[PDB]
């Protein structure tokens, strides 16, 4: 007979050394077998015939939790995707050269050390209040765990009075986590 | 190739809700498989290629821990016997009747509520400083968890001035535990 097995939470992001509670349940009344399989340490906190609640702990990297139940010789299962993350904590802006001749080129560069996963980190390069460029990571250019975005522009007369800045956004929403923002201190360019 | 697997401690007695650390080791250099199997909650505290140290917890009744390692497709293993215990905490002595005619019979009775395992509990019936009787439990007469020892004697003139008492001894030495003693308050008989 067709039965279901569910895991709450289906996905969740947690920081290094973090932990989480998982409720592994099924529609089967008397499961012959039932459990949450994981490579991490786990404590069955509580169970009933139709569910088991565990506390899984000390998560260091992405990992999958396998929740399963056997009903009349038939096994069903469902996984929970746990992701690790460290939010942008420092965002540095650099203008190269700091002194530029009007109408000539310069390089804006943004760097965010220690942030993961990087394939969910996007950096924005602003000028005053206009977005000049932005890029998501995760293809290799400083990828799983350390990123940088550099853009070239030409110095304009108005850059004598508008700030350049960068914004890091770690969107963990599709990984069961939230959205983290960190702005850099603004930097003005010296033009002549 | 012949290898060994050892568990420390080979046996241990612990109280209800207690816990213990187990060091599961082998002589095999690179075990393909290795672990401590148990029905209790367990935390791998630390490991090396030749050992795993776990903290097993919340022990409620006797239980066996299965320590195993696989070396080149061959499995070896060794168990650790965990016993639960609650030491004698109260020992009551009763003389029936309290007033006895010299040369006539009376019943000494000792009772120790809540003590386990009972097959390692021995009660002693003393008169002054002489052991009158003693019995080990574990055959059914109030057995796994609640015991009583009753003995009959004839009232003697000297019982007018010597105390009757009982001593409970829980010897857990063959179960990896220690030895617990609890005496009862002394009771004198009234003879006429
Ligand atoms: C957990 O992670 C796995 C790994 O990607 C996800 O599996 C994919 O799920 C989609 C949607 O059903 C399929 O199209 C893919 O083929 C699956 N890939 C694999 C390797 O199985 C799964 O969906 C994730 N679940 C959640 C809730 O995040
Ligand atoms: C774990 O999840 C299960 C499955 O959804 C929960 O079970 C339900 O719990 C509520 C309250 O106990 C009941 O109204 C439902 O009917 C229960 N369903 C079943 C099949 O028993 C359970 O409460 C959760 N447990 C914990 C500790 O979070
Ligand atoms: C959480 O996980 C980490 C990584 O597995 C554990 O760190 C190891 O700890 C041992 C023993 O304390 C050290 O000898 C290792 O060098 C550590 N490895 C790494 C990669 O850091 C940490 O101990 C775990 N925490 C708990 C409470 O089990
Ligand atoms: C950045 O701020 C400037 C204002 O200092 C914005 O300029 C606007 O220009 C548009 C079109 O010329 C007008 O609709 C607004 O009235 C102006 N705003 C102000 C405050 O003067 C500019 O649009 C803003 N850019 C972005 C991307 O928001
Ligand atoms: C921004 O300008 C810099 C500096 O002129 C460019 O860097 C040069 O790139 C070429 C092609 O990759 C290299 O061969 C040169 O050695 C680089 N110059 C120096 C001085 O190192 C860079 O390509 C530009 N980037 C963008 C995004 O416009
Ligand atoms: C460029 O950035 C600087 C640095 O934040 C801005 O200067 C601040 O401006 C406010 C409003 O006038 C003052 O109360 C602060 O004390 C200033 N801080 C410093 C360090 O000077 C400046 O407003 C920005 N310029 C533009 C054009 O947006
Ligand atoms: C753990 O408990 C088991 C259960 O009795 C003990 O197993 C017996 O061990 C003796 C000595 O080798 C054998 O003669 C018996 O046949 C075994 N019985 C069974 C059912 O296997 C074991 O010795 C105990 N170990 C310790 C250290 O207490
Ligand atoms: C667990 O038991 C093992 C096996 O006896 C211990 O390993 C020995 O530890 C000492 C010090 O580390 C060494 O001198 C021995 O040579 C080790 N033997 C091997 C095979 O490595 C281990 O120390 C114990 N671990 C804990 C945490 O108690
Ligand atoms: C230690 O083991 C006991 C016995 O398995 C656990 O007691 C159960 O606890 C649940 C949830 O707290 C209660 O709903 C049950 O009625 C209890 N059963 C019995 C027989 O007492 C106790 O929770 C365990 N402790 C830990 C920390 O897991
Ligand atoms: C109990 O105590 C009495 C002493 O009050 C013991 O009587 C002893 O009797 C033996 C043999 O007649 C003598 O060797 C001792 O000198 C006596 N002891 C004393 C203190 O007078 C009696 O032996 C003791 N019984 C036990 C079992 O120890
Ligand atoms: C101690 O004396 C008591 C009381 O006389 C004995 O109890 C009797 O035992 C018989 C045989 O089992 C029963 O049929 C009677 O009903 C009991 N008498 C009463 C009043 O209940 C007891 O057997 C003696 N025990 C010992 C160890 O000497
Ligand atoms: C019988 O038991 C009683 C109760 O312990 C003993 O009485 C004690 O004796 C000592 C020594 O003389 C006194 O310091 C205590 O205060 C007494 N307690 C009580 C409640 O009276 C008595 O010594 C024992 N009798 C025999 C013959 O051993």
Curated annotation (Swiss-Prot), chains A, B:
GO biological process per UniProt: cell adhesion; cell-cell adhesion
Glycosylation sites: 23, 58, 81, 129, 152, 163
Keyword annotations from UniProtKB, A to Z: Cell adhesion, Cell projection, Disulfide bond, Glycoprotein, Immunoglobulin domain, Membrane, Repeat, Signal, Transmembrane, Transmembrane helix
GO molecular function ontology, one term from the record: integrin binding
Span of domain Ig-like C2-type: 17-74, 103-173
Disulfide bonds: 24-67, 28-71, 110-166
Positions on the Extracellular side per record topology: 1-192
Keyword Nucleotidyltransferase: no
Protein localization: Membrane; Cell projection, Microvillus
Keyword Repeat listed: yes
GO CC terms in record: cleavage furrow; membrane; microvillus; plasma membrane; uropod
Mode of membrane association: Single-pass type I membrane protein
Superkingdom of origin organism: Eukaryota
Complex formation: Interacts with RDX, EZR and MSN.
Family: Belongs to the immunoglobulin superfamily. ICAM family.
Function, as annotated: ICAM proteins are ligands for the leukocyte adhesion protein LFA-1 (integrin alpha-L/beta-2). ICAM2 may play a role in lymphocyte recirculation by blocking LFA-1-dependent cell adhesion. It mediates adhesive interactions important for antigen-specific immune response, NK-cell mediated clearance, lymphocyte recirculation, and other cellular interactions important for immune response and surveillance.
Official protein name in the record: Intercellular adhesion molecule 2
Organism: Homo sapiens (Human)
């Amino acid at each position: 007979k067709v039965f279901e097995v569910h895991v709450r939470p289906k996905k969740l992001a947690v920081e290094p050394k973090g932990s989480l509670e998982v409720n592994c349940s099924t529609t089967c009344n008397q499961p012959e077998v039932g459990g949450l399989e994981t490579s991490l340490n786990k404590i069955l906190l509580d169970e009933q015939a139709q569910w088991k609640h565990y506390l899984v702990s000390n998560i260091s990297h992405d990992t999958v939790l396998q929740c399963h139940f056997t009903c009349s010789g038939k096994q069903e299962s469902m996984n929970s995707n746990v992701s690790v993350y460290q939010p942008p904590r420092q965002v540095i802006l650099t203008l190269q050269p700091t002194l530029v001749a009007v109408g000539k080129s310069f390089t804006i560069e943004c760097r965010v050390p220690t942030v993961e996963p990087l394939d969910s980190l996007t950096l924005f390069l602003f000028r005053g209040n206009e977005t000049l460029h932005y890029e998501t990571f995760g293809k290799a250019a400083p990828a799983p765990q350390e990123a940088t975005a550099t853009f070239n522009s030409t110095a304009d007369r108005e850059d004598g009075h508008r700030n350049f800045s960068c914004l890091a956004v770690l969107d963990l929403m599709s990984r069961g986590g939230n959205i983290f923002h960190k702005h850099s201190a603004p930097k003005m360019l010296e033009i002549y």
